[PDB]
């Protein structure tokens, strides 16, 4: 439908933006509570992130799956992009990190098992998310995983898949080699993001971006001595720098340290 | 404007990557319609999600003059046809 600031009750701000904020909302007719992200178009062209914005709502539209946050659609006035999203109460997995300082076999294994599912869901549809990290995760009511921010997707048809994009810890040795990239990007994210709750640091952190670069395309990290056996079984399978080496997402839900450890 | 990339007696690529839309205006789907040049048929169609860029038609005639028409249908506008001729 033909969405407007009018056909929502705005209530308090849910959090920060770099472009805007995003506030709690309400739809009057259905008394649905959302949540209503205001992005200023200033603040967007300056940065120059429009084509990103064009590529999150084009595709994140489409996109319903228990462990990705919904995209009911958008509008824009003369000032402000409005995006209409889904509400997670529990905010976002980065702060509960911040909190327990690591996360437990457990909690982690059910994390990349919802992962998993939402990213087979997206690699069905031949869509690569291209920037799995846990400031990209919102958490649901009953404390489900949601994947966000799609402005790094891409449709792996619609695209030649050759330009470096997502976070500098997180991203692929494929990319920094500069070579073509299909959906094995997210199968190494998500071997970096499995490290990164167990231990609480990624694998290749470095004082410098020279040297993160460097690691990541040399595969250069190692694992503490607290990591179960089950755990670097899956994360150096997930970390392997041939693409081709990397297993499909059906395998890692059937990996042993998944099944014997995840509530899901 | 409109683009076929590879060709096949029963089957073509299109594109429509150099079509450029509106800023803050973004593409919810797309109407893709094909049939005989000139004819009066009644013109075959389906729709693709408006994150493609290329697209698929299949099970054509051979030797067969076709017109490709794609209508860019965004999520607040209706962007005006784009359209090829192209003879399989
Ligand atoms: C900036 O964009 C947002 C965004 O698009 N979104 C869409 C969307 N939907 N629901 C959201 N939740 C929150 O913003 C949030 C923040 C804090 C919160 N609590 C803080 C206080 N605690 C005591 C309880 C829990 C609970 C919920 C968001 C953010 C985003 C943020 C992080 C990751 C991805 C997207």
Redesign the pocket.
Same mark, same amino acid.
């Given at each position: 439908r033909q969405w407007a600031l009018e056909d929502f009750e705005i209530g308090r701000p #849910?959090?920060?933006?770099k472009f805007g904020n995003?506030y709690l909302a309400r739809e009057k007719q259905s008394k649905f509570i959302l949540?209503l992200?205001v992005l200023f178009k200033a603040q967007l062209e300056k940065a120059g992130v429009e084509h990103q914005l064009r590529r999150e709502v084009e595709i994140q539209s489409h996109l319903r799956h228990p462990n990705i946050?919904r995209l009911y659609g958008y509008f824009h006035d003369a000032t402000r992009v409005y995006?209409i999203?889904?509400?997670?109460?529990?905010?976002?997995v980065y702060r509960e990190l911040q909190k327990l300082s690591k996360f437990d076999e457990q909690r982690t294994a059910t994390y990349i098992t919802e992962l998993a599912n939402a990213l087979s869901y997206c690699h069905s549809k031949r869509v690569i998310h291209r920037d799995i990290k846990p400031?990209?995760? #919102?958490l649901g009511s009953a404390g489900e995983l949601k994947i966000?921010?799609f402005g790094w997707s891409v449709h792996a048809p619609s695209s030649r898949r050759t330009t470096l994009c997502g976070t500098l810890d997180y991203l692929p040795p494929e990319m920094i080699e500069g070579r073509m990239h299909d959906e094995k990007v997210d199968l190494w994210s998500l071997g970096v993001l499995c490290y990164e709750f167990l231990v609480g640091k990624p694998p290749f952190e470095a004082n410098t971006y020279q040297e993160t670069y460097k690691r990541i395309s040399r595969v250069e990290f190692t694992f503490p001595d607290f990591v179960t056996e089950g755990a670097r079984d899956l994360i150096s399978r997930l970390l392997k720098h041939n693409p081709s080496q990397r297993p499909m997402l059906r395998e890692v839900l059937e990996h042993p340290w998944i099944t014997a450890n995840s509530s899901k | 404007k409109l683009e076929v990339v590879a060709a096949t007696p029963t089957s073509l690529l299109i594109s429509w990557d150099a079509q450029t839309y509106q800023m803050y205006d973004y593409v919810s789907y797309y109407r893709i319609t094909y049939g005989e040049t000139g004819g009066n048929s009644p013109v075959q169609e389906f729709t693709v999600p408006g994150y493609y860029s290329t697209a698929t038609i299949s099970g054509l005639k051979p030797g067969v003059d076709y017109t490709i028409t794609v209508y860019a249908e965004g999520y607040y506008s209706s962007y005006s046809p784009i359209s090829i001729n192209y003879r399989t």
């Open positions: #849910l959090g920060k933006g995003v949540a992200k946050l995006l999203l889904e509400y997670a109460p529990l905010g976002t400031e990209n995760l #919102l966000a921010d | -």
